[PDB]
Swiss-Prot record:
Sites of Phosphoserine modification: 129
UniProt protein name: GTP-binding protein Rheb
Cited function: Small GTPase that acts as an allosteric activator of the canonical mTORC1 complex, an evolutionarily conserved central nutrient sensor that stimulates anabolic reactions and macromolecule biosynthesis to promote cellular biomass generation and growth.
Enzyme's top EC category: hydrolase
Recorded GO CC terms: cytosol; endomembrane system; endoplasmic reticulum membrane; extracellular exosome; Golgi membrane; lysosomal membrane; membrane; plasma membrane
Membrane topology: Lipid-anchor
Outcome recorded upon mutating residue 59 to A: Unstable protein, which cannot load GTP
Length: 170
């Protein structure tokens, strides 16, 4: 089928760069203008392994330990991107909770899940090691990748990987 449509949800704690990472991929630039997000949606077109896709990305509002996991992000979502900031132990802690809830909500369905450690560029502020987040991604039997919302190639690698990870379960 010349084109396929997939809906991806980008979840995580606030300020980690869910939007930055999303816009970088979608528009190609890096915005510094920190705007708390309500919910944005961009429809990006990208091809993976010859197959072109129609990606409907849902850049969600940041949540935390005690926040209801939106039931709509529980249905009709083909892939999930759970991003944390390697410069924040709190984001790391929180993503484990969001992941927990997410799994409960969705019940038992083979939905691709990948873990992203954002802000690899800010070397002087990293507190989470690569090997650590990596280990988490393995415990979830999920994909892992680190990234910078200022390093397009890596942002693109993120959205490519999830689809790779998805067409694998289908
Ligand atoms: N140096 C650097 N800064 C980054 C990176 N990703 C995001 N940031 C910065 O971190 C801040 C928050 O990013 P943003 O995308 O708004 O985070 P968010 O998770 O979408 N926040 P919210 O949940 O409130 O909607 C911005 O000022 C942004 O420029 C990165 O890879 N490197
Ligand atoms: Mg946002």
């Amino acid at each position: 089928p010349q084109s396929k449509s997939r809906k991806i949800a980008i979840l995580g704690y606030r300020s980690v760069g869910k939007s930055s990472l999303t816009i970088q991929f979608v528009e190609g630039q890096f915005v510094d203008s920190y705007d708390p997000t309500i919910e944005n949606t961009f429809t990006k077109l990208i091809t993976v392994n010859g197959q072109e896709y129609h990606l409907q990305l849902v850049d969600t509002a940041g949540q935390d330990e005690y926040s209801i996991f939106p039931q709509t992000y529980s249905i009709d979502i083909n892939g999930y991107i759970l991003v944390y900031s390697v410069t924040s132990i709190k984001s790391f802690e929180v993503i484990k909770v969001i992941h927990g809830k997410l799994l409960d909500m969705v019940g038992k369905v083979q939905i691709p899940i990948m873990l992203v450690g954002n802000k690899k560029d800010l070397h002087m502020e990293r507190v989470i090691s690569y090997e650590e987040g990596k280990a988490l991604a393995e415990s979830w039997n999920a994909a892992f990748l680190e990234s910078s919302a200022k390093e397009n190639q890596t942002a693109v690698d993120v959205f490519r990987r999830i689809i790779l990870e998805a067409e694998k379960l289908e």
